[PDB]
Design a protein around this ligand. Structure first.
Ligand code: VKV
Length: 134
């Protein structure tokens, strides 16, 4: 019964963000700035309907979805790719597959304790982020 991810979440760790960005072909100059940043994530969730806003001083990225409903996603101001995205529940873990030109691209997001965990995958690279609730 930990599917409720509502809140404002502040990043406390960001492991292998460098490798994940390189797997997405982010250029070096962009990576050099992006790797330093503390991200904030605001999740507005009504059951299976999610509105998410991820913010930083350098980039912001918003995505809304309903669990179980495939949608077109354009990762504007990140890697700027078009994918078909589907978010599902595996237990109380939110799982996203982003089908497109990059193999094995997706993410998983879940609550444990008072922390939000987010694992981002692209190819053979996994980035592990942890956020603390504000
Ligand atoms: C926006 C703040 C970015 C700062 C770095 C700026 C530029 C790096 C370019 C590309 C990095 C690719 C991706 C960025 C990582 C996570 C974004 C959010 C993706 C996961 O969020 C999901 C909902 O959306 C689940 O919560």
């Amino acid at each position: 019964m930990t599917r409720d991810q509502n809140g404002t979440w502040e990043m406390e760790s960001n492991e292998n963000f460098e490798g994940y960005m390189k797997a997405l072909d982010i250029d070096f100059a962009t990576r050099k700035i992006a790797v330093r940043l503390t991200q904030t994530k605001v999740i507005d969730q009504d059951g299976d309907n999610f509105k998410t806003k991820t913010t930083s001083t350098f980039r912001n990225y918003d995505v809304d979805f309903t669990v179980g409903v495939e949608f077109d996603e354009y990762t504007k101001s990140l890697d700027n790719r078009h994918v078909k995205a589907l978010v599902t529940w595996e237990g109380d873990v939110l799982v996203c597959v982003q089908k497109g030109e990059k193999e094995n691209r997706g993410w998983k997001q879940w609550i444990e304790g008072d922390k939000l965990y987010l694992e981002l995958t692209c190819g053979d690279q996994v980035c592990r982020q942890v956020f603390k609730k504000k």
